[PDB]
């Protein structure tokens, strides 16, 4: 009823404070929310995201979304999580 793809999606942000999404898929109102292919993402399992300390600089791996998966682009950057 609220759509299966209108939930807010977890992010992280690098030194520019501009956010990128964490992973490429989540459950949304009991459905499967999938980000478009090519979207930049952090290759980070969600249970990890959920247990991170806000504002701590972490070494986050980057990737792009493909068919609901954050495919590792083999490069890294420091990122941090909101409060």
């Amino acid at each position: 009823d609220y759509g299966t793809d209108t939930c807010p999606f977890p992010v992280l942000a690098n030194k520019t404070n501009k956010a990128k999404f964490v992973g490429c898929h989540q459950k949304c109102n009991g459905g499967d929310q999938k980000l478009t292919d090519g979207t930049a993402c952090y290759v980070v399992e969600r249970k990890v995201w959920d247990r991170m300390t806000p504002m701590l600089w972490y070494e986050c791996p980057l990737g792009e979304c493909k068919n609901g998966v954050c495919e590792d682009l083999r490069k890294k950057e420091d990122c941090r999580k909101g409060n």
Partner: protein, 68 residues
Amino acid sequence: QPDSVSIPITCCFNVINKKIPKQRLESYRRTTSSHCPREAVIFKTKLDKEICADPTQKWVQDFMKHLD
């Protein structure tokens, strides 16, 4: 220092298709394109479920105005 910028924990990727019935709506929060990839408004329902909405749609501006 310790940095005092506020970083969002979630951003919106897609928004709702039709206006939400007012009787459901409980709260809102606004997502800045300064940090999020696209600016959006996040309504929170009486069941504490969160819905992404387009800040340019007329009905959003009415409702978030309603909630003040």
